Amino acid sequence: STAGKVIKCKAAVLWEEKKPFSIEEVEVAPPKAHEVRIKMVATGICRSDDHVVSGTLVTPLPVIAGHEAAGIVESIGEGVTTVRPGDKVIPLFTPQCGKCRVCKHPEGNFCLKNDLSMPRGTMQDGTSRFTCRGKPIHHFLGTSTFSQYTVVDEISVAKIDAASPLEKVCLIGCGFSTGYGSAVKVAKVTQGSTCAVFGLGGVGLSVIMGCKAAGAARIIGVDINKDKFAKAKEVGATECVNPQDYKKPIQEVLTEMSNGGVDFSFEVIGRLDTMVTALSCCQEAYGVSVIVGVPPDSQNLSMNPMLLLSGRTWKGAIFGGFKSKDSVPKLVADFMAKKFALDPLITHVLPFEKINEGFDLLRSGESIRTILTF
Amino acid sequence: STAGKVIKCKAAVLWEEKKPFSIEEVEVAPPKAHEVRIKMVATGICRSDDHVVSGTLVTPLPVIAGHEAAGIVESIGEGVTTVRPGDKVIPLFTPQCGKCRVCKHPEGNFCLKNDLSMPRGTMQDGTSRFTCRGKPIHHFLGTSTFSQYTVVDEISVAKIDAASPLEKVCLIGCGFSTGYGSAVKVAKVTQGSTCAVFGLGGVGLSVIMGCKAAGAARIIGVDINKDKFAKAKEVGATECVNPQDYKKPIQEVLTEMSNGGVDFSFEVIGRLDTMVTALSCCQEAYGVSVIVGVPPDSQNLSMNPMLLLSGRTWKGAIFGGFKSKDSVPKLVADFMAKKFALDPLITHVLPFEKINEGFDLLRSGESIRTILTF
Ligand SMILES: Nc1ncnc2c1ncn2[C@@H]1O[C@H](COP(=O)(O)OP(=O)(O)OC[C@H]2O[C@@H](O)[C@H](O)[C@@H]2O)[C@@H](O)[C@H]1O
Ligand SMILES: Nc1ncnc2c1ncn2[C@@H]1O[C@H](COP(=O)(O)OP(=O)(O)OC[C@H]2O[C@@H](O)[C@H](O)[C@@H]2O)[C@@H](O)[C@H]1O
Numbered sequence: 001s002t003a004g005k006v007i008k009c010k011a012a013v014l015w016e017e018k019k020p021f022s023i024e025e026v027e028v029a030p031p032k033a034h035e036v037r038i039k040m041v042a043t044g045i046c047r048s049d050d051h052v053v054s055g056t057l058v059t060p061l062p063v064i065a066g067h068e069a070a071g072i073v074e075s076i077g078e079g080v081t082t083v084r085p086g087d088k089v090i091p092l093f094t095p096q097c098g099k100c101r102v103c104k105h106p107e108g109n110f111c112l113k114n115d116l117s118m119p120r121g122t123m124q125d126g127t128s129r130f131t132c133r134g135k136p137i138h139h140f141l142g143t144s145t146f147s148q149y150t151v152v153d154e155i156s157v158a159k160i161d162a163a164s165p166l167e168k169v170c171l172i173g174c175g176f177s178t179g180y181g182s183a184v185k186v187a188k189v190t191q192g193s194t195c196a197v198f199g200l201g202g203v204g205l206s207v208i209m210g211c212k213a214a215g216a217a218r219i220i221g222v223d224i225n226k227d228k229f230a231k232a233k234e235v236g237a238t239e240c241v242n243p244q245d246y247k248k249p250i251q252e253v254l255t256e257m258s259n260g261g262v263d264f265s266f267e268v269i270g271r272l273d274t275m276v277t278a279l280s281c282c283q284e285a286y287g288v289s290v291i292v293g294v295p296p297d298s299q300n301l302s303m304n305p306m307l308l309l310s311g312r313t314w315k316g317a318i319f320g321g322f323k324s325k326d327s328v329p330k331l332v333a334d335f336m337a338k339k340f341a342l343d344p345l346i347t348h349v350l351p352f353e354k355i356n357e358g359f360d361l362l363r364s365g366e367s368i369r370t371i372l373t374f
Numbered sequence: 375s376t377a378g379k380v381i382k383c384k385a386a387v388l389w390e391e392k393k394p395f396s397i398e399e400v401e402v403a404p405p406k407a408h409e410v411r412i413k414m415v416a417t418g419i420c421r422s423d424d425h426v427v428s429g430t431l432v433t434p435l436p437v438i439a440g441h442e443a444a445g446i447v448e449s450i451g452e453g454v455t456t457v458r459p460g461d462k463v464i465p466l467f468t469p470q471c472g473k474c475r476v477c478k479h480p481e482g483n484f485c486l487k488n489d490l491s492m493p494r495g496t497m498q499d500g501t502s503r504f505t506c507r508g509k510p511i512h513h514f515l516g517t518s519t520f521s522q523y524t525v526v527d528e529i530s531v532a533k534i535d536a537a538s539p540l541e542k543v544c545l546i547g548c549g550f551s552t553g554y555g556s557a558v559k560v561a562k563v564t565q566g567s568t569c570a571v572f573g574l575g576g577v578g579l580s581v582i583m584g585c586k587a588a589g590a591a592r593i594i595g596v597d598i599n600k601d602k603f604a605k606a607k608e609v610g611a612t613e614c615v616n617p618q619d620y621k622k623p624i625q626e627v628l629t630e631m632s633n634g635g636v637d638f639s640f641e642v643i644g645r646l647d648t649m650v651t652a653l654s655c656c657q658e659a660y661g662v663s664v665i666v667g668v669p670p671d672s673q674n675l676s677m678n679p680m681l682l683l684s685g686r687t688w689k690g691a692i693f694g695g696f697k698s699k700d701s702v703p704k705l706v707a708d709f710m711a712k713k714f715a716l717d718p719l720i721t722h723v724l725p726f727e728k729i730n731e732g733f734d735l736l737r738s739g740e741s742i743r744t745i746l747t748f
């Protein structure tokens with residue numbers, strides 16, 4: 001029907017920092033070589049999208065944001081082989097080009113073609129496929145999922161099982177994989193181990209599920225909001241601790257409770273102080289602490305390097321350490337085989353045109369995850 | 375001859391902080407159960423011994439310091455099985471009790487019976503075996519090797535090959551193993567990789583040798599003293615860089631030279647700023663930076679956690695990550711089989727009674743390592 005033609009559809013456009021998203025009629029050019037055009041079925045609202053709004057995550061404006069989605073391939077440009085029209089897909093904010101020294105490395109996943117480091121707001125060829133009233137609109141992280149239709153480079157899209165439910169599995173595009181991979185791929189949580197998870201929003205819940213899939217014996221959820229504990233326990237936390245209940249510092253409580261420190265700690269709040277507390281509460285000799293997110297305007301933290309010298313390991317990663325194009329389809333296969341449950345993460349579902357309401361829910365802390373549906 | 379009796383010999387005693395060592399006549403009690411008395415053959419002067427002098431490394435005084443040595447077993451207390459009189463040995467400042475949760479762990483080596491964390495200056499049973507004119511003298515790290523004879527717990531001593539030359543292999547007790555293990559056990563340097571080593575004193579040379587044994591392709595030595603480069607190249611550095619030669623920051627030079635950052639960086643200066651530079655110069659996606667020493671009075675460092683979020687790993691360790699009682703005898707076997715060379719590390723050899731001269735050489739930077747011989 002619409003292959004090789006411009007498509008007019010609606011998108012949420014951010015014209016300037018600190019303003020609401022405007023629903024606009026936009027033109028979406030046909031995909032050029034190695035590009036795929038996708039019809040969006042559902043998209044998650046993530047913190048990172050809010051950082052674009054606030055000017056924290058610097059990216060050229062005006063922009064169509066959104067990076068956590070699923071959809072259906074509408075058409076493919078010249079020389080696309082990995083996907084076909086009608087295939088279900090997940091766009092990847094971390095590409096997997098397969099060629100660079102990161103993609104060749106057994107451990108790396110932060111592909112050198114990413115648009116995160118020095119953002120240009122373009123496709124890989126350096127132009128945009130979006131216009132609004134003749135004016136070009138930037139892409140975001142080579143995904144731009146706040147549009148009924150989007151164009152993405154083939155290196156940034158993963159084919160998933162034909163029978164997948166898209167309203168759930170869009171979370172595999174960011175929040176779930178980030179948390180789950182942090183435990184299963186970055187930390188390599190072992191059977192029988194003790195884990196502590198600082199922050200019980202969506203990504204901390206996903207870390208907990210990863211710790212549980214890896215066979216942790218004890219998983220201690222830490223959060224200053226007691227309302228988060230009920231869901232943390234439902235997905236696998238064996239205990240929950242609220243640092244405001246104590247007279248002593250939380251790392252001293254966690255070191256007492258785990259008889260000398262936890263095997264794996266995970267920082268998923270994004271706060272400087274809690275990064276350092278998380279490192280300290282892991283066992284001095286062989287503890288691993290993983291930093292799951294960092295706000296993109298963070299200052300320096302302050303840390304005594306003696307924490308590392310006994311044998312601790314501090315690490316970070318993007319997208320849970322997963323090589324994106326390889327892993328996403330296998331995570332979706334595991335969901336289809338019922339190995340984990342995404343529904344506890346989904347607290348609100350809104351139609352796309354209520355995007356600004358979605359962001360309010362995110363800003364206020366009522367939501368674990370809001371999904372927008374098209 | 376002297377088994378089961380007190381032995382009168384000479385030791386170097388530190389009576390107060392910031393004063394020279396006094397050579398004193400001391401009494402060395404016979405070993406009680408699971409203790410070994412050793413006749414010292416040679417002992418290294420290490421930085422850590424100077425930190426005791428300066429009051430940086432807090433330990434009870436008066437004390438017999440020294441922890442890097444080799445010697446010959448003079449007698450064994452009740453229930454010692456791992457060693458016999460006449461066996462060549464290396465005392466271990468990191469014990470290996472075999473029982474605790476660290477010794478049971480495949481990765482840990484900082485045994486919970488160490489005397490480094492909360493120092494008591496005693497044997498494991500809580501008393502001393504040294505007196506000077508009726509006054510008790512503390513032990514240091516359960517070793518105290520600045521004495522013609524010392525008593526150490528069996529968990530702190532390793533039996534080595536009978537044919538070993540003790541004047542060389544005493545370095546296996548601290549400096550060499552720390553550097554070499556940092557590359558071979560903590561970083562797990564891989565074949566073909568690029569490594570950067572900040573600091574080309576004794577331990578940095580040992581890191582270089584570890585990188586070379588592991589098959590690194592390029593090993594970049596970094597040091598502000600150009601006189602260190604000649605030996606760094608002799609043991610395996612492929613290139614040497616002096617940061618004072620440049621107008622730009624060293625991590626930017628190292629990132630240019632290695633086409634996007636090194637695989638493994640090692641900080642072996644002990645300085646805060648250079649810890650952070652070392653982390654930054656490793657590849658963002660899969661780089662590993664290892665902190666080899668920390669001065670025991672270090673302040674906090676200041677660091678942007680964004681360095682970790684792309685995929686870098688920061689780690690530290692004591693004694694090169696090696697389980698001490700298992701590893702020392704195999705390192706000595708490798709020396710005996712000619713797999714590495716300790717002689718480039720040994721720049722000065724002094725008789726024990728010139729200990730204060732040894733420390734001057736260490737304080738001035740003339741020495742790579744001074745060995746004291748008895
Ligand atoms: N000092 C604190 N100690 C413990 N918990 C805290 C503290 N301050 C805030 N929190 C809790 O941290 C949690 C933050 O959760 P969300 O804001 O829902 O965030 P989520 O989508 O999970 O991710 C937050 C962001 O931080 C990054 O580490 C992570 O990758 C993500 O980008 C909340 O449950 C909040 O109560
Ligand atoms: N800013 C700098 N940049 C690079 N090199 C430096 C700098 N400042 C000092 N150095 C160099 O660092 C080296 C320190 O070497 P030594 O003092 O001989 O120390 P060594 O016995 O090898 O160990 C020093 C201590 O630091 C710890 O990391 C290590 O484990 C040991 O405890 C010297 O070669 C010195 O020139």
Ligand SMILES: [Zn+2]
Pocket residue numbers: 095096097098099100101102103111112113
């Ligand atoms: Zn790549």
Ligand SMILES: [Zn+2]
Pocket residue numbers: 046047048067068174175
């Ligand atoms: Zn996200």
Ligand SMILES: [Zn+2]
Pocket residue numbers: 469470471472473474475476477485486487
């Ligand atoms: Zn032990």
Ligand SMILES: [Zn+2]
Pocket residue numbers: 420421422441442548549
């Ligand atoms: Zn030492």
